[PDB]
Amino acid sequence: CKGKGAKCSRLMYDCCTGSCRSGKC
């Protein structure tokens, strides 16, 4: 995964630790 500011999807959040909304971590 990535970290903050990393493009992600709440359902399939690809962030290591943080959040995932609007298509971002």
Side-chain angles (χ1 to χ4, degrees), residues 2-13:
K2 295 210 247 238
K4 237 225 198 153
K7 216 235 97 108
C8 71
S9 82
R10 41 216 265 247
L11 200 110
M12 293 207 136
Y13 74 112

Side-chain angles (χ1 to χ4, degrees), residues 5-25:
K7 216 235 97 108
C8 71
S9 82
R10 41 216 265 247
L11 200 110
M12 293 207 136
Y13 74 112
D14 284 313
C15 318
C16 298
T17 45
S19 290
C20 193
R21 165 135 204 180
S22 241
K24 290 228 218 91
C25 290

